[PDB]
Design a protein around this nucleic acid. Structure first.
Lengths: 364, 362, 469
DNA sequence: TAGGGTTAGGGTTAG
């Protein structure tokens, strides 16, 4: 916008050129030796001009500047100032360094599958500005960008940050179905989505783990007793956890899928009562770990179940790429293996496997 | 022209190689075997190793070691050998505790369910997965996994028949994989197509030349003397894009050559391989790898944990090391130069890195 | 030692030559075909000692043998055509068909006479063969190639290392002389001195110098098992190093001259109170590592700096080397190749049943497992470490179960006792190795057989006798 | 200083 200073008083020259050294003139610590300073006075006021008068200057009221996606997602980018427009997805409060972690989905006209990003708001500014709610569209300007230990990209909140709210959250949260793709499209690096569904068929199982951990110190329990009880936990509370690593394909490509918690019971095709009985049985020794491939009636039952055609069944899987879009580390060259079909081993160049994560598993 | 098959080294790059392909039985019977390796077939250039079929059983034959079936998919009839898994050393049940007794009962129920699922007669519907083989001039599928599909309304086969043409059109009727794209190796002779690409190739060519000679210091005009680098840079693209002067054609060509060399040198400086000093020479550069004194100073600084207190946790962060070096050695130090110095120091077994962007002394 | 000059020694013909004593050889045809590496010690006049050296040999030529047919037979029909077979006919057919089909631009041929007395039939006892030699870069011909004049072809898949060893009459570790060495601008090995020979013909054998002393290290480590993924981690390890271990007399006394120890902590527990102060008061050279990655980096740096030639221990190949490689991969410790001598990027596949990748993981060095040597040498009730100590040295050894390992971090005294126990175990392993004279016996066996020295320690008697034959 | 720990696993025969 174009603002006009309408400071009243006598027509004293130089008053709009520089701050008088001998008069009232103070500067912030970050502006100690500035060549141009003009302190505003209390009696001074501001006004807004019309559009027609300054249409030439106001013709530059295009979209606010936004850094290129390549600049934003490159670690070699030494500049630590970025700006973008995004839509807030979820807001959470972090407590011990008080932080309000924000998850924003970018909006750009370059890539039709914008990546996700995290914005952290720390203590110096923590009456966070009004309007920062899930579902709204907000424009962030001049954020600090840093690369973490795990090569992730996240934007901090510095004293030179300007935040403007554009649209309010919708009254009704409409639903959207995930796209339906083949698993081969993710191996072609041209604009592929990272959250879709596919009709895969289970092939094998790599491992399976079941625990009974302590609710406070997250240590393996035995009959509802912490191993370090009396030193790290004040009560006797036990919760269950489960991991599994499938290996699915859908007629075009191969991928390995990791599932957690109740998705384990969903993938195994077990009723809730059977799942509860299995967990109760597991509660006795404390842990059950099986490594079918990779570097007791319960064991035999699990081994039989993991190879029967009751598990290796066609399913419909809604998956999310394990490597987050923010992460940047392309360093994988093709490998070389020794497949042998007709008693005549040969050598081929193979690509690294696709790693996924489960969100929902349904039968068909 | 006889279409030469894809080389046997690039077969694994195709995603279809490791996936159970859905194909018509007529296609399975009609594909041509590959001469390079028997047992692996070709369909439109795609190296297909495994198949997936669904059909109606029309004939059951049993031998002492394997079953035989005929799968009809309304397009053709093929055999499907199903091997017999030996039930040697059957699990012995024992009258254990009540929970273990329930587990054994559930195991017996699961075994009965599996045995019911694997029972097949004439007229049923079967799904067979496995690999193609040739035996006595006959093509057949050696099944890996197979079970009887319970389809009482004929929805699964209808869905399969509706789905197969779409998968064919969108995947199988496509040219080939992407192995080093198309002439990604080199740039189709030093002429190339993109002028910045020419600048980049000249840049790391000059970098390689400087490394191989073990150059300590060099000048841009010295790099201009190199006939090989000049010949590599002398391409139609730069000459055609530098015709901004008529009376000074040679002069403007030399100026464009100087500009492209400066761009290459600044690209190298961005990587930190070469660093500059304020010695009055605008084109004087020193190779970072050969600066032994900088390595010694950095190692000496690290050995004291950047003058941090001993009770403070040993080691330093990358930013802390950079700040200490800037305040102590030279304010003009760049991050890339420091990173290269640290990597070179670690290569010679001088420092050990504990976390990422964290380094400690021995 | 500066890398701009090589320790050349003047020869009898007033020509400076390279002299060294090779120990182990490595070959990699998939990446650099026709290249064989040699490692060993080279005398240095500046310090009057021996340092590790790497020698590169290039341009190894394959050899093929063709058996001419008695009477011409058409390939298409398998019937005679009415003409005899001559050597020039075989050469012309080869040049006109095989070179065109398999893209063999350059080759050398000459008539030779050879004998065959093996199980393959349809081969005369004595005949004349066609010997064709060409570089390894051109593709290998099929093993079952048959033509209008040659029925069977030999030497299709002969490894470069075997050909180089056979054609130069090298019998185990022996002194070598290299004529006209050339410096390498790009280092490829971790050794001090590097050189390369253009052709294999520039290497000869000298048989008048006693073997030089080597460097030997014995090490052991303690591994605790994680309770959530059944993975084995590393908590502490120790080693002992000798610098002048001879190979032609009794073991030196004392068996060791220097040692080091490093102790780490698990992810959950912390060190006992004032553990650093306790260590300092006792005045014992024990280095504390913050994490497992620090421990692995320190161990690799110590291995690289000490530069050992022979590494010994108990149950290395089966368990310890695999565990160490897995931990290096998981912790993403950089520069894993320091455990060997040749710069490599891609770690070989782990978990191999035959252990071929695990065996190749330490090319250029020596891995001596006391278990296999004990099995080959003497008979005992069992080959566990405690039983071996009881039967050989007649001493009692304490066994620490995995259950107490978690509890040893309660007090500093328990941690010191565990570290001392590991040190004593390493010392016992070294003493057991020195007792049986494993190294001189292995050297004598290798010299008699003539095979590679490193393969002798693997117990492959069939390999040694195959090489001898 | 901001993701938990992290890496990589099956790749063959029988008539």
């Amino acid at each position: 916008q174009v603002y006009r200073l309408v400071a009243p008083g006598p027509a004293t020259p130089m008053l709009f050129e520089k701050d008088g050294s001998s008069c009232i003139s103070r500067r912030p610590l970050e502006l100690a030796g500035c060549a141009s300073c003009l302190t505003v006075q209390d009696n001074w006021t501001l006004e807004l001009e019309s559009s027609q008068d300054i249409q030439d200057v106001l013709d530059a009221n295009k979209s606010l500047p936004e850094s290129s996606l390549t600049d934003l997602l490159s670690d070699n980018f030494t500049d630590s100032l970025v700006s973008f427009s995004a839509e807030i997805l979820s807001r959470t409060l972090c407590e011990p360094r008080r932080c309000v972690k924000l998850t924003v989905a970018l909006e750009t006209a370059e890539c039709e599958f914008p990546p996700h990003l995290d914005v952290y708001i720390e203590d110096p500014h923590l009456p966070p500005s009004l309007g920062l709610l899930p579902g709204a569209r907000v424009h962030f300007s001049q954020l600090e960008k840093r690369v973490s230990r795990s090569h992730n990209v996240y934007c901090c909140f510095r004293s030179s940050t300007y935040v403007q709210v554009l649209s309010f959250p919708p009254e009704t949260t409409i639903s959207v179905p995930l796209p339906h793709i083949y698993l081969a499209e993710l191996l072609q690096g041209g604009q592929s989505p990272f959250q879709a569904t596919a009709s895969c068929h289970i092939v094998s199982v790599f491992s399976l783990q079941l625990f009974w951990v302590c609710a406070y110190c997250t240590s393996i329990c035995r009959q509802g007793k912490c191993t370090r009880l009396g030193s790290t936990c004040p009560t006797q509370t036990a919760i269950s956890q489960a991991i599994i690593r499938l290996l699915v394909e859908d007629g075009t490509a191969e991928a390995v899928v990791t599932c957690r918690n109740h998705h384990v019971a969903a993938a195994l095709g077990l009723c809730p009562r059977e799942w509860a009985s299995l967990l109760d049985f597991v509660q006795v020794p404390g842990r059950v770990v099986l490594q079918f491939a990779g570097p007791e009636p319960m064991t035999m039952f699990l081994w039989t179940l993991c190879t029967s055609p009751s598990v290796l069944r066609p399913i419909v899987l809604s998956f999310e790429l394990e490597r987050k879009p923010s992460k940047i580390v392309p360093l994988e060259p093709p490998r070389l293996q020794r497949f042998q079909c007709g008693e005549l081993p040969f050598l081929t160049h193979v690509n690294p496997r696709l790693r996924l994560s489960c969100l929902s598993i349904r039968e068909s | 022209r006889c279409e030469e098959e894809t080389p046997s080294l690039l077969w694994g790059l195709d995603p279809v190689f490791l996936a159970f392909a859905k194909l018509y039985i007529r296609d399975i019977l009609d594909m041509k075997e590959s001469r390079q390796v028997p047992g692996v077939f070709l369909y439109n250039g795609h190296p297909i190793k495994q198949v997936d079929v669904l059909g109606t059983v029309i004939g059951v034959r049993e031998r002492d070691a394997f079953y035989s079936y005929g799968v009809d998919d309304s397009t053709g009839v093929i055999n499907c050998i199903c091997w017999k898994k030996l039930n040697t050393e059957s699990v012995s049940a024992a009258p254990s505790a009540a929970r273990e007794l329930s587990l054994t009962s559930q195991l017996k129920k699961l075994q009965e369910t599996i045995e019911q699922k694997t029972k097949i007669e004439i007229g049923d519907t079967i799904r067979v997965r496995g690999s193609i083989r040739t035996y006595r001039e006959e093509r057949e599928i050696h099944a890996t996994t197979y079970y009887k599909v319970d389809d009482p309304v004929w929805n699964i086969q209808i869905a399969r028949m509706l789905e197969l043409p779409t998968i064919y059109r969108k995947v199988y009727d496509q040219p080939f994989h992407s192995s080093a794209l198309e002439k990604e190796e080199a740039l189709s002779n030093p002429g190339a197509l993109d002028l910045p690409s020419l600048t980049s190739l000249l840049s790391e060519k000059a970098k390689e030349f400087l490394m191989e000679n073990r150059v300590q210091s060099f000048y841009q005009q010295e790099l201009e003397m190199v006939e090989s680098l000049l010949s590599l840079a002398n391409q139609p693209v730069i000459h055609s894009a530098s015709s901004d002067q008529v009376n000074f054609k040679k002069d403007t060509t030399s100026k464009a050559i100087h500009s492209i060399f400066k761009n290459a040198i600044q690209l190298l400086q961005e990587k930190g391989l070469v660093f500059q000093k304020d010695d009055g020479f605008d084109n004087l550069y020193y190779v970072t790898r050969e600066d032994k004194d900088l390595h010694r100073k950095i190692h000496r600084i690290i050995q004291q944990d950047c003058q941090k207190p001993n009770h403070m946790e040993k080691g330093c962060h990358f930013l802390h090391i950079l700040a200490c070096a800037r305040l102590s050695i030279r304010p003009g130090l760049s991050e890339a130069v420091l990173q290269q110095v640290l990597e070179l120091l670690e290569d010679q077994s001088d420092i050990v890195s504990t976390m990422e962007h964290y380094y400690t002394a021995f | 030692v500066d890398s701009s000059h090589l320790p050349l020694v003047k020869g009898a013909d007033e020509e400076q030559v390279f002299h060294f004593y090779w120990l182990d050889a490595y070959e990699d045809q998939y990446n650099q075909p026709g290249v064989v590496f040699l490692f060993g010690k080279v005398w240095i006049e500046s310090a009057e000692t021996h340092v590790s050296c790497c020698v590169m040999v290039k341009n190894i030529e394959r050899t093929l043998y063709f058996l001419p047919r008695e009477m011409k037979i058409d390939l298409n029909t398998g019937k005679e055509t009415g003409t005899p077979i001559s050597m020039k006919d075989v050469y012309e057919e080869f040049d006109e068909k095989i070179a065109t089909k398999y893209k063999i631009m350059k080759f050398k041929s000459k008539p030779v006479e050879k004998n065959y007395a093996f199980e393959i039939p349809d081969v005369p006892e004595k005949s004349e063969y066609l010997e064709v030699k060409y570089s390894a870069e051109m593709p290998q011909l099929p093993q079952d190639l048959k033509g209008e004049t040659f029925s069977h072809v030999f030497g299709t898949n002969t490894s470069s290392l075997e050909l180089f060893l056979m054609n130069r009459k090298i019998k185990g570790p022996c002194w070598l002389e290299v004529k006209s060495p050339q410096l390498l601008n790009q280092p490829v090995s971790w050794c001090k001195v590097e050189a390369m020979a253009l052709k294999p013909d520039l290497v000869n054998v000298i048989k008048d110098v006693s073997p030089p002393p080597l460097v030997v290290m014995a090490f052991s480590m303690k591994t605790m098992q994680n309770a959530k993924n059944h993975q084995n981690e590393i908590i502490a390890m120790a080693a002992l190093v000798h610098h002048s271990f001879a190979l032609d007399k009794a073991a030196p006394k004392p068996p060791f001259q220097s040692h080091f120890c490093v102790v780490s902590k698990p992810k959950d527990c912390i060190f006992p109170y004032a553990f650093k102060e306790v260590i300092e008061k006792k005045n014992v050279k024990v280095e504390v590592a913050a994490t497992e990655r620090t421990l692995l980096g320190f161990f690799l740096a110590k291995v690289h700096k000490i530069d050992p030639d022979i590494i010994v221990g108990h149950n290395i190949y089966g368990f310890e080397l695999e565990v160490l490689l897995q931990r290096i991969n998981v912790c993403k410790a950089p520069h894993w190749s320091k455990i060997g001598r040749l710069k490599r990027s891609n770690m070989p596949k782990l978990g191999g049943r035959s252990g071929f990748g695990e065996r190749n993981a330490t090319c250029g060095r020596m891995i001596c497992d006391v278990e296999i040597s004990a099995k080959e040498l003497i008979r005992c009730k069992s080959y566990h470490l405690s039983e071996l100590v009881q039967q050989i040295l007649k001493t009692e050894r304490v066994v620490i179960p995995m259950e107490n390992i978690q509890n040893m971090y309660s007090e500093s005294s328990q941690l010191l006792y565990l570290l001392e126990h590991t040190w004593k175990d390493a010392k016992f392993i070294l003493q057991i190795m020195c007792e049986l004279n494993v190294l001189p016996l292995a050297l004598q066996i290798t010299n008699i057989a003539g095979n590679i020295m490193s393969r002798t320690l693997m117990g492959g008697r069939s390999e040694r006798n195959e090489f001898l034959l």
